[PDB]
């Protein structure tokens, strides 16, 4: 009874505890996961409303209809959101080209983008969310990166107050310090200085809690970030996550843990290959952020297999090894899947994934979130309200 992730599970009757240990059903437990309080740690602001009906809602409320770009032709791959074959990362970023840099530069569009995304987290029962944005991408000749960040913060801080404290999601912001291919270390300096300033401007409500080192790949300009000077970042309270995408080495991961002092790892799908790194990543507490849909589409994994094969999703292996694994959505729009579909696609990606392990990935995320003491106790008190099962008759 001392292996349950939350203390409230121990106070259940044996009928339900026996139910927690059976495999998750991706066709019947759709309603139990939905009511579950989730925790999002990898969500990109500029990828929420990329195509469909939400893209029109964002483009409709623009403050400069004349400035809005035309909606270019972005055809989704067939079988979407489960493509016939993977599409890659470069070809995956382009599906969200109807929204982002060239759309959200409109102050009006940014309001709907930040307010429609909060309504998508609330609908999903998210209790905590770290949103990732690049304010320097949405700036113009009259709106500096600090002005855009001011707006983004208060757009989420406004939605957070118009919501009852019982169902209120808590949104925090991560500044994606992108390793620009075309931009130089000037871009990094501005990004790291913007987070250090924001990391002390706000102490309550929406806060800038860390920096996301996207572009950690490209081990040719190695690294323009391992020069670092990240010590100011560490002394102001900020936390570092490395967006280890599009790469299959282990040396970068080693240097992110011990030179960058990173606390989370993004899309670290090849950790089991090196068991020495896997043991360190599990004893130091480093958290691994996995995105089921975004990974099945960029990389592609076997679906509905009946055995843990060689090329299977590493979620179950990570859990066995002790790694603190979390499940996220990456791009809500670009992947067309909410935080519930991703936790339900796990049943088909990892054969045998128990529905108790789902609660473990949520308890892990609750410990890997860059929240403060007040924010944690409010998050812990909301995951303690785990809903009771739906179908236990067999």
Ligand X SMILES: Nc1ncnc2c1ncn2[C@@H]1O[C@H](COP(=O)(O)OP(=O)(O)OP(=O)(O)O)[C@@H](O)[C@H]1O
Question: From the annotation, which residues make up the binding site?
Answer: 42, 44, 46-47, 93, 96, 101, 134, 137-138, 178-179, 212, 217, 243, 330-331
Q: Which stretch binds ligand X (CB under 6 A): 105-113, 172-180, 312-320, 378-386?
A: 172-180
Rule CB under 6 A: is residue 44 a binding residue for ligand X?
Answer: yes
In the set 134, 172, 329, 340, which binds ligand X (CB under 6 A)?
A: 134
Q: Which residue, 295 or 361, is less far from ligand X as judged by CB?
A: 295
Q: Which H or E run includes 150?
A: helix 145-161
CA distance 231 to 247: 26
In the set 130, 217, 289, 357, which binds ligand X (CB under 6 A)?
A: 217
CA distance 57 to 60: 5
Q: Which residue, 45 or 233, is less far from a copy of itself as judged by CB?
A: 233
Q: Which residue, 133 or 225, is less far from ligand X as judged by CB?
A: 133
In the bound complex, what is the minimum distance in angstroms from residue 243's beta carbon to ligand X? 5
Residue pair 386/9 in contact (Cβ under 8 Å)? The answer is yes
Phi, psi values for residue 234, rounded to 5°: -70, -30
Q: Which residue, 104 or 120, is less far from ligand X as judged by CB?
A: 104
**Residues in the annotated binding site for ATP:** 44, 46-47, 93, 101, 134, 137-138, 178-179, 217, 243, 330-331
String marking each residue 320-359 x if it binds Zn ion according to CB under 5 A? ----------x-----------------------------
In the set 125, 179, 348, 355, which binds ligand X (CB under 6 A)?
A: 179
- Burial group, residue 2, by CB count within 10 angstroms (0-12, 13-18, 19+): exposed
**3-state secondary structure at position 106:** coil
CA distance 308 to 351: 7
In the bound complex, what is the minimum distance in angstroms from residue 53's beta carbon to a copy of itself? 39
CA distance 42 to 9: 27
Rule CB under 6 A: is residue 100 a binding residue for ligand X?
Answer: yes
H helices present in 64-144, as ranges: 90-93, 107-123
In the bound complex, what is the minimum distance in angstroms from residue 199's beta carbon to a copy of itself? 11
Q: Where are the extended beta strands (E) located within 80-238? A: 126-133, 170-176, 208-213
Q: Which residue, 137 or 272, is less far from ligand X as judged by CB?
A: 137
Rule CB under 6 A: is residue 326 a binding residue for ligand X?
Answer: no
Rg (CA), the chain: 20
């Amino acid at each position: 009874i001392s292996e349950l992730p939350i203390p409230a599970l121990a106070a259940w009757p044996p009928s339900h505890l026996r139910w927690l240990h059976e495999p998750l059903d991706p066709v019947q437990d759709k309603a139990w996961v939905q009511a579950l309080p989730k925790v999002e740690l990898h969500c990109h602001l500029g990828g929420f409303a990329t195509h469909g009906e939400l893209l029109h809602k964002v483009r409709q409320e623009a403050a400069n209809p004349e400035s809005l770009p035309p909606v270019r032709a972005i055809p989704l791959p067939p079988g979407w959101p489960i493509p016939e074959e993977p599409i890659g990362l470069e070809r995956y970023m382009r599906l969200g080209d109807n929204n982002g840099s060239a759309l959200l530069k409109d102050p009006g569009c940014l309001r709907a983008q930040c307010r429609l995304l909060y309504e998508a987290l609330l609908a999903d029962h998210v209790a905590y969310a770290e949103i990732r944005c690049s304010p320097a991408n949405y700036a113009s000749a009259s709106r500096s990166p600090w002005v855009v960040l001011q707006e983004i913060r208060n757009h989420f801080q406004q939605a957070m107050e118009e919501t009852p404290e019982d169902r209120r999601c808590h949104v925090n912001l991560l500044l994606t310090a992108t390793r620009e291919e075309g931009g130089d270390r000037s871009r990094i300096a501005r990004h790291l200085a913007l987070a250090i300033t924001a990391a002390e401007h706000w102490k309550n409500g929406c806060r800038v809690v860390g920096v996301d080192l996207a572009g950690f790949e490209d081990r040719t300009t190695r690294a323009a970030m391992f020069a670092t000077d990240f010590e100011p970042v560490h002394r102001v309270g900020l936390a570092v996550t490395v967006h280890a995408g599009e790469n299959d080495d282990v040396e970068g991961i080693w240097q992110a843990v011990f030179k960058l002092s990173a606390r989370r790892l993004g899309h670290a799908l090849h950790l089991s290959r090196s068991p020495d790194l896997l043991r360190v990543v599990a004893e130091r507490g480093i958290a691994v952020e996995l995105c089921p849909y975004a990974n099945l589409q960029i990389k592609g994994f076997p679906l509905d297999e009946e055995q843990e094969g060689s090329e299977t999703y590493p979620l179950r292996g990570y859990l066995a090894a002790g790694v603190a694994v979390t499940l996220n959505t990456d791009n809500l729009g670009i992947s067309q899947a909410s935080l519930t579909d991703n936790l339900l696609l796990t049943a088909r990606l990892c054969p045998g994934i128990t529905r108790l392990e789902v609660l473990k990935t949520q308890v892990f995320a609750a410990q890997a979130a860059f929240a403060n003491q007040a924010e944690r106790k409010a998050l812990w008190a909301r995951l303690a309200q785990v809903p009771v099962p739906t179908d236990t008759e067999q």
